[PDB]
Design a protein around this ligand. Structure first.
Ligand code: CLA
Ligand code: CLA
Ligand code: CLA
Ligand code: CLA
Ligand code: CLA
Ligand code: CLA
Ligand code: CLA
Ligand code: CLA
Ligand code: CLA
Ligand SMILES: CC1=C(C/C=C(\C)CCC[C@H](C)CCC[C@H](C)CCCC(C)C)C(=O)c2ccccc2C1=O
Ligand code: SF4
Ligand code: SF4
Ligand SMILES: [Ca+2]
Lengths: 139, 156, 42, 31, 747, 72, 80, 135
């Protein structure tokens, strides 16, 4: 699962709302070799600890805007979770342990078209059909 | 001092002297919307009566009928009937339409009426509340010349 | 004059049809038109 | 010479025939 | 230590970089690929914080560009004194400041535009100026046009002095960073040396040039008999029939000041507190005493901060001591840090200093506009009705642009110069930590006031059309009296010394000759309703601008907004659409709202003055105002603003063809063009326009006349900046042409 | 002109603020069934063209009617 | 729930993956480039729609598209 | 043919010459408008007749359209000059005025220089060398 001490943050207003209790809630988890201060994605500034840190955010763009901030503090070990309200913590970033910029094997060409972009079919080819013109199984 | 909301720095509120005082917490949590140990009819009956009583106010002295006396208090009552019919229409319409699988979230405070049998009982309270109050302030306004006398000793 | 009268036939009929379709019936109508907009499928 | 008092009430019940048939069409078009 | 440090010759002086435009940005110096390089060269020429990175080299560019700016004001200030010297009727106006109209700026005889040379009285043909220069030179003691000419010469040699000092302090002796960062020493010399010695120098001019000259001009010496101002110092017996309670000698007349027998000055340093009933302005004895109490208070307050002699205050210690062991207990909510780390904000970044110096200079220029109509300071200013309105309207617009600039650089500070290291839990961190509670309650009071100021104008508009004038918010129907503002008009007339200061409050009608200078401005329901239009439009102007300052870092939409920049169009069509999420597009939207706010301040002024203040007095005592009590009854419906103000008072700019007000009728209609022209850039987007250049580039590539500077449509930000630069130009010049055609058809 | 000059992300950060003040206030027992968003990009072009058109027609169809039925 | 398709004009410069704020794209191995990579979008349910991957693609008439489709609660960025 | 009487015997134009100022704008340019056709309100109209205003309308055509195609031909022959020098990116901002004047005096006889490129086929670019869209 997840664990860690929360950073020294004096409370905010841009934090979690009733969506985080009812639908989904994200959690970033990093570790720091320093008692440094960083900028919160929910507005303000907080002091991260020296052990395992743990911060609950509301949506995934707030975690990776924070994850792109820790990479400028030379902290590139963060794990992002997604916490459903029944307690199910899935682990979503980075999925394979490796960052999505550098290539790993076993990964799949998912949502890939084997044509140029300019040779997509016309929307009159797909008239009264279920598919869109960018799905288009020919080439 | 302003600390985070119930000890959670990640929640989006602050434990400020307005929402987390001793006074303003014991005033809000004792208003009939939040008072502990009330059936939802008695919540709505007390919420309604405080609202029918004042809503006849702004139409009997600055309304279109303010020049007369007997017809002024009718147009102030007729207003608070229509304000409180169309508001108690809107909360039967609210509970029909929000309790279908998401009872304000099954998974929490400031909205402790999450059942649809606790809201259909509330709607019966605000209707009979806001029209007992609309009549009590109507019977105290059409009988105002008879109530100026008994509060001045003019009736011996 | 100082009053809304009607010389036309059935002059009592705008007296009730103008409050009906404009401020008495639409809040019922906006309730019924809200109960199928926000009605759930299963 | 305007129309009578009854001719208004005659028009109101004749226009229930395209008022109900407008409901048969609006639901057969499956709102 | 507060010592001086410079740098000997840091920058060479050559025309080598004038041949390479765009040298400051690295992407602009590599060539002009498209026509966006043309526009990016001017949008980045003064962004000195992006040319370099170090604050030592930025602050030398700031300091040397102020000198080249001061050398631009001195060119314009030598053009106002030169036009009063050679192309004016200042001789004919000083003899008779009632019948002769103030005019400079004659027009050349070409293209038939000499019809603008209307008759100004006394055979002078020119344009009636409404800038108040003539009423200001009379208060300075100018009598002949030679003294105006050698002020315009003396400013041209002061422009070449200030232009030489910008070359000298960037190319020869440029200061270092620790010379700019002693702002305690700077406040000592600006309070005492600039604002204290400036109002001590001016109170020496007033009592030696202005107070003798304006005393003899009230007896009507008709500009032969008046002496030149050096003859009141060279001949000290000449200033003894005037002001006889003093001695007026070179050493013998000063010694009442040092022996503290200041009753010898009580005839030319008064505390009368009223308007001069022969001229209309304030007493120049009352003004000369005023600058002496200002120069004392500023030279005193310039010895507050600590330079290198130990004694004095330090702002570093005063800011860092406002934590919360030591506050008042009802405002002890601002942090155990307090505002430590805030002297490092206003010293290590010039955008933090510019946002305070613009909002203070903006709010000063509206306080100035509100005081020069109610306490008119110049002789024959208050009765020149074209000058009273064109000086209120000028400094309201000037002082409202600077407010929006004070909220632009309070947003460039957050995107660029904001540091979460030095601002942990201080008074600026704690504002961003609750910024959805500032904006929630601001967007409610903008909403509370929009219903209770504007929808009460729609209630009155419907009751007046219904034929129910007893049901609307009138002085005859449902009265809304300004209870707390009618009471301050009662206080400021029951505390009078013996003359009623500011006749706007009450008591007396100053009616110096012909027209009326000042009258009581009473307040009814039409003044209650219009001060809440101003309260509503100021709050939405704040709400637009404060939303761009607090949400310049991040939001719930884009949590990495400070990495996209200050001036970016959007973050794509995602999240439903995120156009105008930047901090720039809240300055852009707060410029329309500054416009709507200040155009109702100058419309409340222009109609309340005409109906309740200005007018003419007869031989009995009653006053017939310009529109005649029109504001009280008809300014409560905005059909009355349409009919009784915009339609009925534009009969002087509509019917201003074939006459001498002909240019105001053209600027009125040329103004309506630029407003409607602005809506091409505001309403449409650049993807239509880029896809329209491509069909026009084709017709040039066909005829082989295509350019290599490739034609691109303007940016998204650049297309919004030219849609607000035209709305705020053609909406101002149509009000400038209406305020001035209406009042220079009367006087 | 509000729907044509102001664009969508001015209003999404403002509805995000009024939806904060609704969740954190007492005695406000309503709650949105579907979350308030600022209405979309190609919608406010249509919502701001509907008012431009109606205000073009209510103004000229009241000037043409009243400047002919009064001064014939 | 948008639709991020990726076409074979890719060059494997990884610039769309570094520009994505929500980690929708990732680099998988391929044979038709010198980097041997091509982008793929496995987390298209996290597509916020912002088309920031489209401004970073350097191929002319870019090799990645975002087709804005049926928007949901995580494809519209609602923290409430 | 029309009711546009000349301004000599128009009974509404002679009042514009009766009460008028002098200076330079309503005396000599007003007696030069006397040979112009003017309607029933004394304002000189511009009609199109066969021969009485054949060259009277063709002087504003031929004088303008020469120095309309004199600005255009010196701007076209300058952009073609700086593209054979392979420096057109930087010569369009910094105008090489010894060449722009040389391409101006080559455009002084442009009607006998355009038709030397029409019959030679060098005025237009051919359709397979011009950038277009997906059509
Ligand atoms: C569609 C044509 C049309 C229109 C524009 C109107 C308009 C009006 N009628 Mg009506 N009316 C109509 C047809 C119409 N009528 C017909 C055919 C009848 C005979 C039954 C009537 C009988 C009638 C009476 C008795 C009265 C009016 C009155 C009025 C006025 C106020 C509305 C109201 O309160 O009464 C309510 C309207 C009805 C009871 C009947 C209207 C329904 C008709 C049959 C069809 C309209 C529906 C329409 C097709 C919906 C499509 C539009 C939608 C897609 C947006 C208003 C000017 C009042 C008046 O006189 O004002 C002083 C009044 O009391 N009408
Ligand atoms: C604010 C700066 C400013 C502005 C807007 C003007 C504007 C003007 N000047 Mg002026 N001038 C200025 C500063 C300025 N001046 C200064 C500092 C000097 C002193 C060197 C002069 C000395 C000057 C002279 C001698 C004349 C003008 C004239 C003019 C007018 C026409 C000039 C032109 O054709 O171009 C024009 C209204 C001309 C004029 O007014 O024609 C009658 C003219 O004769 N100016
Ligand atoms: C004729 C005298 C002269 C000459 C040849 C220069 C030449 C130069 N100045 Mg300059 N300057 C001058 C007078 C002069 N200045 C005066 C009178 C002022 C006061 C307004 C300035 C204040 C000034 C500033 C603030 C800057 C320059 C800069 C520059 C350099 C580039 C400017 C450009 O537009 O391209 C350039 C070498 C810029 C520079 O040094 O580039 C890094 C720079 O930022 N100058
Ligand atoms: C008493 C000494 C003194 C005086 C009079 C000034 C005056 C001025 N300063 Mg300076 N300054 C001073 C000391 C002084 N400073 C010290 C000790 C420091 C070091 C911390 C600074 C650092 C400083 C900076 C960084 C800047 C200024 C700027 C300015 C100008 C502001 C423009 C304005 O609105 O005013 C009125 C305008 C006038 C033209 C008034 C003229 C005043 C003259 C020069 C005084 C002497 C005239 C004569 C002998 C009497 C102004 C002329 C700003 C500026 O504009 O740069 C040029 C600015 O950038 N000052
Ligand atoms: C409180 C300061 C103050 C005030 C009220 C005035 C007022 C006046 N001055 Mg002035 N002056 C001042 C300071 C001031 N001065 C200083 C510091 C200098 C030297 C830089 C001068 C140099 C000067 C000259 C050369 C002239 C005047 C003139 C005048 C008269 C013209 C009208 C006007 O200025 O608009 C009203 C102005 C204001 C309402 C405020 C002005 C801005 C000051 C600097 C604000 C200072 C901040 C203050 C401590 C905070 C108090 C808050 C307050 C602003 C509401 C007028 C009575 C003219 C004159 O002589 O008339 C006969 C004239 O020619 N003054
Ligand atoms: C910067 C301001 C300034 C300057 C340069 C002067 C300059 C002068 N004053 Mg002076 N004065 C001033 C402000 C100033 N005053 C103020 C603020 C007051 C108090 C209101 C006075 C009241 C005063 C009196 C009563 C006299 C002078 C006089 C003089 C002249 C000779 C005094 C002397 O030699 O020493 C001299 C030119 C004397 C003079 O020559 O009268 C014409 C004279 O008797 N002054
Ligand atoms: C002391 C006053 C002052 C100073 C020094 C600055 C300085 C600056 N501002 Mg600024 N600003 C001010 C007042 C000031 N502003 C006011 C009063 C407003 C409200 C309108 C603004 C609103 C503003 C915005 C929105 C922006 C700036 C920006 C900038 C920076 C670059 C300017 C530039 O691009 O070159 C010069 C560009 C021009 C001269 C083109 C402007 C064309 C004008 C408006 C036409 C005028 C019409 C004319 C009367 C006819 C620069 C540091 C830009 C920035 O990016 O900050 C870092 C930015 O986007 N300002
Ligand atoms: C005249 C046109 C117009 C109107 C009516 C508005 C109205 C509004 N603007 Mg807007 N704006 C406009 C032009 C207009 N604007 C233009 C041209 C721009 C271009 C730059 C803007 C840019 C702008 C910005 C940037 C902002 C606003 C905001 C607002 C809201 C302010 C809150 C308020 O005042 O509550 C009061 C409501 C009114 C004043 C509207 C009139 C109310 C009528 C008279 C009562 C209606 C009666 C009844 C309810 C009708 C129901 C009948 C039924 C049959 C339906 C408000 C609804 C601000 C906001 O969001 O507030 C929080 C905001 O920040 N505006
Ligand atoms: C006063 C308002 C105004 C004016 C003058 C224009 C003018 C123009 N529009 Mg329009 N437009 C407007 C409002 C306005 N628009 C609004 C509100 C919209 C809705 C968003 C549109 C949307 C629009 C579209 C979609 C298009 C235009 C186009 C055009 C151009 C038409 C072709 C032409 O040569 O005409 C006359 C030329 C002029 C009036 C230019 C004035 C000449 C100046 C004054 C020269 C002097 C300059 C000097 C500095 C002063 C023209 C410049 C079309 C176009 O660009 O054609 C290729 C085009 O397709 N407009
Ligand atoms: C009209 C318009 C354009 C097109 C605007 C253009 C092309 C700017 C026009 C400026 C012209 C091109 C000035 C160029 C002058 C030349 C240098 C010629 C002068 C040479 C002589 C002086 C010799 C946009 O790009 C745009 C973008 C976003 C929103 C709205 C709009 C918009 O409304
Ligand atoms: S889409 Fe862009 S970043 Fe991804 S492989 Fe293609 S060129 Fe490289
Ligand atoms: S739309 Fe946004 S989140 Fe989706 S792939 Fe493009 S940049 Fe990434
Ligand atoms: Ca009434």
């Amino acid at each position: 699962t997840l664990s860690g001490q929360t950073p020294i943050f004096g409370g905010s207003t841009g934090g979690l709302l009733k969506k985080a209790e009812v639908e989904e809630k994200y959690a970033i988890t990093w570790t720091s070799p320093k008692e440094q201060v960083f900028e919160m994605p929910t507005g303000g500034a907080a002091i991260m600890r020296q052990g395992q840190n743990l911060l609950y955010l509301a949506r995934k763009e707030q975690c990776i805007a924070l994850g792109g901030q820790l990479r400028k503090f030379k902290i590139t070990d963060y794990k992002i979770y997604r916490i459903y309200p029944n307690g199910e913590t899935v682990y979503i970033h980075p999925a394979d342990g490796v960052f999505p910029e550098k290539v790993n094997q076993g990964r799949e060409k998912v949502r890939y078209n084997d044509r140029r972009i300019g040779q997509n079919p016309s929307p009159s080819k797909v008239k009264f059909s279920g598919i869109a013109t960018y799905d288009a199984p020919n080439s | 001092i302003i600390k985070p909301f119930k000890g959670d720095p990640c929640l989006g509120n602050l434990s400020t002297p307005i929402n987390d005082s001793p006074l303003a917490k014991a005033f809000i949590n004792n208003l009939p919307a939040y008072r502990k140990g009330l059936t939802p009819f008695m919540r709505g009956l007390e919420i309604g009566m405080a609202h029918g009583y004042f809503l006849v106010g702004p139409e009997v002295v600055i309304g279109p009928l303010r020049e007369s006396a007997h017809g002024a208090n009718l147009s102030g009552l007729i207003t608070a009937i229509y304000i409180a019919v169309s508001a108690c229409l809107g909360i039967s319409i609210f509970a029909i339409t929000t309790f279908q699988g998401n009872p304000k979230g099954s998974y929490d405070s400031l909205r402790p009426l999450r059942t649809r049998e606790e809201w259909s009982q509330l709607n019966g309270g605000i209707f009979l509340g806001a029209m007992g109050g609309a009549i009590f302030a109507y019977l105290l306004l059409e009988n105002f010349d008879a109530l100026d006398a008994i509060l001045r000793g003019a009736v011996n | 004059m100082t009053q809304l009268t009607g010389d036309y036939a059935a002059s009592w009929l705008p007296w009730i049809m103008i409050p009906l379709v404009f401020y008495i019936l639409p809040f019922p109508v906006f309730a019924i038109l809200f109960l199928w907009i926000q009605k759930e499928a299963s | 010479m305007s129309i009578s008092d009854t001719q208004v009430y005659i028009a109101l019940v004749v226009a229930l025939v395209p008022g109900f048939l407008a409901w048969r069409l609006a639901t057969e078009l499956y709102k | 230590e507060v010592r001086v440090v410079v740098d000997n010759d840091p920058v060479p002086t050559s025309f080598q970089k004038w041949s390479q435009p765009g040298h400051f940005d690295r992407t602009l110096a590599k060539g002009a690929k498209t026509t966006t390089w043309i526009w990016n060269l001017h949008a980045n020429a003064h962004d000195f914080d992006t040319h370099t990175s170090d604050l030592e080299d930025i602050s030398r560019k700031i300091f040397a560009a102020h000198f080249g700016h001061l050398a631009v004001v001195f060119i314009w200030l030598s053009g106002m004194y030169f036009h009063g010297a050679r192309f004016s009727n200042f001789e004919a106006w000083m003899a008779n400041p009632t019948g002769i109209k103030p005019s400079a700026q004659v027009v050349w005889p070409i293209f038939g535009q000499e019809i603008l040379n209307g008759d100004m009285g006394g055979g002078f043909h020119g344009i009636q100026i409404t800038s108040g220069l003539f009423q200001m030179w009379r208060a300075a003691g100018f009598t002949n046009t030679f003294q105006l000419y050698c002020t315009a010469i003396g400013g041209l040699v002061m422009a070449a002095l200030m232009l030489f000092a910008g070359w000298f302090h960037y190319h020869k002796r440029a200061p270092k960073l620790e010379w700019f960062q002693n702002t305690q020493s700077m406040l000592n010399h600006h309070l005492a040396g600039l604002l204290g010695l400036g109002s001590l120098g001016w109170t020496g001019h007033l009592i030696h040039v202005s107070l003798p000259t304006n005393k003899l001009l009230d007896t009507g010496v008709a500009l032969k008999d008046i002496p030149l101002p050096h003859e009141f110092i060279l001949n000290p017996s000449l200033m003894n029939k005037l002001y006889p309670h003093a001695d007026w000698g070179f050493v013998k007349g000063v010694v009442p000041f040092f022996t503290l027998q200041w009753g010898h000055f009580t005839d030319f340093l008064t505390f009368k507190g009223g308007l001069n009933p022969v001229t209309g302005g304030l007493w120049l004895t009352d003004v000369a005493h005023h600058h002496l109490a200002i120069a004392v208070m500023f030279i005193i307050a310039g010895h507050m901060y600590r330079t290198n002699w130990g004694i004095g205050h330090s702002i570093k210690e005063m800011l860092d001591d406002a934590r919360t062991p030591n506050m008042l207990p009802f405002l002890s909510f601002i942090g155990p840090v307090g505002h430590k780390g805030l002297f490092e904000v206003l010293t290590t970044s010039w955008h933090a200093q510019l946002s305070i110096n613009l909002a203070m200079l903006g709010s000063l220029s509206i306080i100035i506009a509100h005081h020069m109509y109610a306490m008119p300071p110049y002789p024959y200013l208050a009765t020149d009705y074209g000058t009273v309105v064109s000086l209120f309207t000028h400094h309201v617009w000037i002082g409202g642009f600077l407010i929006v600039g004070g909220a632009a650089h309070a947003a460039i500070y957050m995107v660029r110069d904001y540091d979460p290291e030095q601002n942990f839990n201080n008074v600026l961190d704690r504002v961003l930590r609750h910024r959805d509670a500032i904006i929630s309650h601001l967007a409610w009071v903008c909403q509370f006031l929009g219903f209770h100021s504007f929808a009460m104008y729609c209630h009155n508009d419907t009751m007046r059309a219904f034929g129910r004038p007893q049901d609307m918010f009138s002085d005859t129907g449902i009265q809304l009296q300004p209870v707390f503002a009618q009471w301050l008009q009662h206080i400021h007339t029951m505390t009078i010394l013996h003359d009623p200061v500011s006749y706007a409050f009450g008591g007396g009608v100053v009616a110096v000759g012909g027209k009326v200078a000042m009258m009581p401005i009473t307040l009814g329901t039409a003044d209650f309703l219009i001060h809440h239009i101003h309260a509503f439009t100021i709050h939405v102007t704040v709400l637009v601008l404060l939303k761009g300052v607090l949400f310049a870092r991040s939001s719930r939409l884009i949590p990495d907004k400070a990495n996209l920049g200050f001036r970016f169009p959007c973050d794509g069509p995602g999240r439903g659409g995120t156009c105008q999420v930047s901090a720039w597009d809240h300055v852009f939207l707060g410029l329309f709202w500054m416009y709507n706010s200040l155009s109702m301040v100058i419309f409340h002024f222009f109609w309340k003055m005409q109906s309740d203040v200005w007018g003419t007095v007869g031989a009995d005592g009653v006053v017939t105002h310009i529109t005649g009590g029109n504001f009280a009854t008809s300014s409560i419906t905005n059909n009355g603003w349409l009919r009784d103000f915009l339609w009925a008072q534009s009969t002087q700019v509509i019917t201003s063809y074939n006459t001498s007000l002909s240019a105001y009728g053209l600027m009125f209609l040329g103004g309506h063009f630029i407003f409607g022209f602005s809506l091409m850039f505001l309403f449409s987007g650049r993807g239509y326009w880029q896809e329209l250049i491509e069909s026009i580039v084709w017709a040039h590539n066909k005829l082989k006349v295509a350019p290599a500077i490739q034609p691109r449509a303007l940016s998204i930000i650049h297309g919004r900046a030219v849609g607000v630069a035209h709305y705020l130009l053609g909406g101002i010049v149509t009000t400038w042409a209406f305020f001035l055609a209406r009042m220079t058809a009367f006087g | 002109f509000m729907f044509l000059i102001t664009w969508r992300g001015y209003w999404q950060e403002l509805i995000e603020t009024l939806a904060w003040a609704h969740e954190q206030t007492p005695l406000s027992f309503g709650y949105w069934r579907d979350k308030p968003v600022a209405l979309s990009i190609v919608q406010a072009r249509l919502v701001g063209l509907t008012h431009f058109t109606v205000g073009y027609i209510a103004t000229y169809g009241a000037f043409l009617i009243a400047s002919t039925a009064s001064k014939f | 729930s948008h639709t991020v398709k990726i076409y074979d004009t890719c060059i494997g410069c990884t610039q769309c993956v570094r520009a994505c704020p929500t980690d929708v794209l990732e680099m998988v191995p391929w044979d038709g480039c010198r980097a041997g990579q091509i982008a793929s979008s496995p987390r298209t349910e996290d597509c916020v729609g912002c088309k920031r991957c489209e401004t970073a693609c350097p191929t002319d008439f870019l090799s990645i598209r975002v087709y804005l489709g049926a928007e949901t609660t995580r494809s519209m960025g609602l923290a409430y | 043919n029309t009711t546009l009487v000349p301004c000599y015997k128009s009974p509404a134009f002679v009042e514009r010459m009766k009460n008028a100022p002098d200076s330079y704008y309503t005396t000599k340019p007003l007696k030069a408008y006397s040979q112009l056709l003017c309607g029933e309100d004394g304002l000189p109209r511009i009609a199109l007749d066969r021969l009485s205003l054949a060259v009277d309308v063709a002087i504003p055509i031929a004088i303008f359209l020469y120095t309309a195609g004199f600005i255009g031909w010196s701007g076209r022959s300058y952009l073609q000059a700086i593209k054979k020098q392979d420096k057109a990116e930087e010569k369009e901002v910094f105008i090489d005025v010894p060449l722009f004047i040389s391409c101006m005096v080559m455009a002084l006889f442009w009607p006998m220089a355009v038709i030397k490129e029409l019959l030679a086929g060098e005025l237009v670019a051919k359709d397979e060398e011009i950038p277009i869209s997906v059509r």
